[PDB]
């Protein structure tokens, strides 16, 4: 029995040594179904996994994709996450919302590329003061063709060292580094009632579910059957790692 799970190199989600959350969760689900998990590796990052891995008839299942994704068929979600703030504990900077005035006085903030945080930075008028810093966190190499992003470890280091005061990150990608950080950081969930100046809503929480090809309904049925069977193990692993999971509603 084989599963042919899609894989790409990205910390801390997927590593060759099998220490990432993807590896544990895939092994647990495969053991629940009784098969042995087989990893099909692609050198390019996760962004290219679907378009080059699933419809090229090489690997059969992808482990992490947003629910109701129109590209591929999705199974039942197994956890709920969202964006979290990051601030040093001893700095006495209590932040709970995106309309707080102190954001206009912070020396520097760290956010990702093509993310709601960047859109809100444009909305509240701070992109010009931080574009150089954002493009300097990685080397100044952002070609049109290639995909560039800031490593979560770099974000955590920037928040810890004091060069950036307030950061915005995604929980699964930074939970491991915040757990093992030498300095005590502080998280806070971003409210879902987040509104821009124009008024359009900006969601901050998301489900996570598996994705399979359009035709393979039987594999979807097997995955659905095994999900409730393996649920306690997945919950235990998530609790151990440190990811702050929100109730599903």
């Amino acid at each position: 029995g084989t599963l042919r799970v899609c894989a790409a190199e990205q910390p801390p989600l997927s590593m060759k040594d099998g220490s990432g959350l993807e590896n544990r969760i895939a092994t647990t689900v495969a053991e629940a179904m009784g098969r042995k998990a087989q990893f099909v590796w692609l050198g390019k990052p996760a962004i290219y996994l679907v378009r080059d891995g699933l419809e090229k008839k090489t690997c059969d299942v992808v482990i992490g994709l947003d629910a109701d994704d129109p590209r591929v068929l999705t199974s039942k979600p197994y956890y709920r996450s969202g964006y979290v703030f990051l601030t040093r504990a001893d700095k006495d900077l209590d932040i709970k919302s995106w309309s707080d005035p102190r954001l206009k006085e912070v020396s520097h903030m760290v956010v990702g590329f093509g993310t709601p945080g960047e859109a809100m930075l444009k909305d509240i008028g701070r992109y010009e003061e931080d574009m150089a810093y954002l493009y300097s966190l990685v080397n100044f190499r952002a070609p049109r063709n290639q995909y560039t992003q800031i490593d979560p470890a770099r974000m955590v280091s920037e928040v810890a060292t004091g060069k950036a005061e307030v950061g915005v990150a995604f929980g699964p990608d930074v939970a491991r580094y915040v757990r093992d950080s030498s300095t005590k950081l502080r998280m806070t969930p971003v409210p879902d009632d987040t509104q821009a100046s124009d008024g359009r809503k900006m969601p901050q929480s998301f489900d996570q579910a598996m994705g399979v090809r359009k035709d393979d309904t039987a594999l979807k049925a097997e995955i659905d059957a095994a999900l409730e069977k393996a649920k306690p193990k997945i919950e235990a692993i998530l609790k151990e790692e440190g990811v702050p999971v929100l109730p599903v509603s």
Binding site: A46, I47, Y48, R51, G64, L65, D66, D69, R71, S81, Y83, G112, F113, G114, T115, P116, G125, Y127, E128, M131, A132, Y135, S136, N139, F140, R141, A142, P143, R144, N145, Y147, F170, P203, F206, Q208
Partner: protein
């Protein structure tokens, strides 16, 4: 200044880039001509010790040759009687981070020379990649002063060459331009204090405009357009760096130059004309105030760059009145000819008949006529867009012949594709981008990927082409013209070639160790004419050869278009000198030997 003009009239010197304040690259020596062009053989060669692109030409003043290099920007001085011995060398120790920021661009464009008065000796002025400007003694090689200009943390690195006007040195800006504007600075050449600084985008106080700005052409834009065209506070990251050449006119006391493209590369993020970006300026030499500016490409979408060379001449117009004119080629396929005194538009023409990105340029209003089929932002596959990102015209230095009233130019021949794409991701995240393909033009061969360059002779007033010739690869570096009826130029294949001026027949060709991306220079030492040229390939045309990249999409399609360059050349760097019959300093072998 005034001593430099007298030094320029002499035929034993090559003092500044372009040899003149008019930037003609023209020599009056006629010792080498069509009668005896087949007898040119090398005289001596010199090697640097770097593997990168060598741009510009060496300088020769008072029996010495000065040689500049790419990163890490070394400098050598050689004596013309004994070229083997090196009088002095300068090798800086730079910060290790400078290489990290800039990877594609590791070149430099030249040095500057100041004759100096009686009290202060002559000076050689240079710039470094980390963002420092230094002055050195011409005879010893010591350092007199050093100042810091750019910031590596922002992402600005220096590739430009300084300019010397009167008692001042003028320095521009260059770099990654991701989150920085562009500015021009003037320093005192003796000590190093700052006199004036001017910006490209911003309020009128930062632009530092004059009272009669665009008085004669009021429809080009007069006041308040630095912030009006931009939507909001985008001008703080607008861009507009200048890294081309300069021109100077003593009669009108003006310096002429042009600015670069706006940022970011996405057109939707910056709506408006984006005024005073990609525009021609004429600025005062002392106070820095601007007299006129003219915009070429409003709201650019093809990621061009208007930083080409500018030339000056005196000619009769169509009516019959003598006028002082300046000529400017551009990457978008349009050559401009304006008046230096005020800025009136005299002529605008197309380099080739396969442009198809602009229908024409209107002389009365100055606005180009666009063709929407070949434009971008259509969100589909735009095909057969010519010219490509590199454009018809390179960053080289063309030539002008006054007696024949002709312009000798080297023009690229490449066409481009464009396909946008958007890729979603996990949690409210997506990536937007575009992919590009580059292929040879209609007059070449597409299957074998050859026939990518042309060389032409042009008349500005009438608009005719006297002759046109094809080449296997692109012509990067420029040309030189001689009063002995000759045009000299180098090729990326690794040849130096000489052509007849009137007809264009090929008369002489020699094989040099590597490709050339510079322009030749000529001089005389003792009744003998010497022609010197650099060699060493790099930059955009040789990105794949240098960095060992095999992906066609890498380098914005540069690797795909230049995939066959590795079958004809390799890397290197140095200088070669040619003379008639190979006559040189070491004709008597006993010169320069031990004891």
């Amino acid at each position: 200044n005034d001593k430099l003009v007298e030094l320029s009239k002499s035929d034993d010197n090559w003092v500044m880039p372009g040899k003149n304040y008019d930037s003609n690259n023209f020599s009056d020596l006629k010792q080498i001509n069509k009668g005896n062009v087949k007898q040119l053989r090398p005289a001596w060669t010199f090697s640097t010790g770097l593997l990168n692109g060598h741009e510009g030409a060496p300088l020769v003043v008072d029996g010495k040759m000065y040689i500049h290099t790419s990163f890490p920007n070394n400098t050598f001085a050689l004596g013309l009687d004994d070229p083997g011995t090196i009088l002095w060398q300068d090798k800086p120790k730079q910060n290790p981070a400078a290489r990290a920021v800039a990877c594609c661009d590791l070149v430099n464009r030249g040095l500057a020379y100041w004759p100096g008065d009686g009290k202060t000796p002559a000076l050689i002025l240079k710039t470094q990649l980390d963002g420092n400007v230094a002055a050195l003694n011409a005879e010893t090689g010591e350092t007199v002063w050093k100042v810091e200009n750019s910031d590596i943390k922002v992402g600005s690195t220096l590739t430009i060459a300084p300019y010397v006007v009167k008692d001042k040195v003028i320095i521009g800006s260059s770099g990654a331009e991701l989150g920085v504007r562009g500015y021009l600075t003037a320093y005192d050449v003796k000590t190093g204090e700052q006199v004036w600084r001017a910006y490209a985008t911003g309020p009128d106080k930062d632009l530092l405009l004059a009272s009669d700005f665009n008085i004669k052409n009021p429809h080009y834009g007069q006041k308040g357009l630095g912030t009006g065209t931009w939507e909001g506070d985008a001008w703080k990251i607008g861009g507009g760096t200048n890294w081309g050449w300069y021109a100077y006119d003593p009669g009108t006391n003006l310096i002429y130059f042009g600015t670069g493209n706006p940022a970011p590369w996405n057109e939707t993020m910056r709506p408006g004309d984006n005024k005073w970006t990609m525009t021609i300026f004429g600025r005062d030499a002392d106070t820095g105030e601007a007299k006129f500016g003219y915009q070429k490409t409003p709201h650019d979408e093809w990621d061009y760059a208007g930083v080409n060379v500018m030339m000056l001449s005196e000619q009769k117009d169509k009516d019959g009145k003598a006028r002082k004119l300046l000529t400017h080629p551009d990457r978008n396929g349009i050559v401009y000819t304006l008046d230096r005194t005020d800025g009136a538009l005299v002529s605008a023409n197309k380099l080739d008949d396969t442009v198809n990105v602009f229908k024409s340029v209107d002389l009365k209003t100055g606005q180009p006529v666009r063709d929407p089929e070949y434009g971008t932002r259509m969100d589909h596959l735009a095909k057969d867009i010519c010219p490509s990102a590199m454009g018809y015209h390179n960053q080289g230095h063309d030539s002008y012949d006054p007696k024949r009233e002709l312009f000798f130019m080297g023009i690229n021949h490449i066409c481009m594709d464009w396909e946008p794409f958007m890729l979603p991701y996990r949690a409210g995240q997506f990536f937007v981008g575009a992919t590009l393909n580059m292929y040879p033009g209609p007059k070449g061969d597409r299957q074998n990927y050859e026939g990518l360059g042309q060389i032409k002779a042009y008349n500005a007033i009438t608009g005719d082409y006297k002759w046109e010739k094809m080449e296997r690869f692109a012509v990067w570096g420029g040309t030189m013209a001689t009063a002995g009826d000759l045009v000299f130029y180098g090729t990326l294949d690794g040849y130096l070639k000489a052509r007849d001026s009137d007809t264009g027949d090929l008369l002489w060709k020699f094989k040099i160790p590597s490709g050339a991306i510079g322009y030749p220079m000529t001089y005389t030492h003792k009744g003998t004419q010497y022609v010197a040229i650099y060699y060493g390939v790099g930059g955009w045309p040789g990105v794949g050869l240098v960095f060992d990249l095999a992906d066609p999409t890498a380098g914005l399609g540069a690797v795909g278009a230049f995939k066959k360059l590795a079958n004809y050349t390799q890397m290197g760097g140095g200088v070669v000198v040619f003379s008639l019959d190979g006559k040189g300093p070491y004709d008597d072998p006993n010169v320069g030997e031990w004891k």
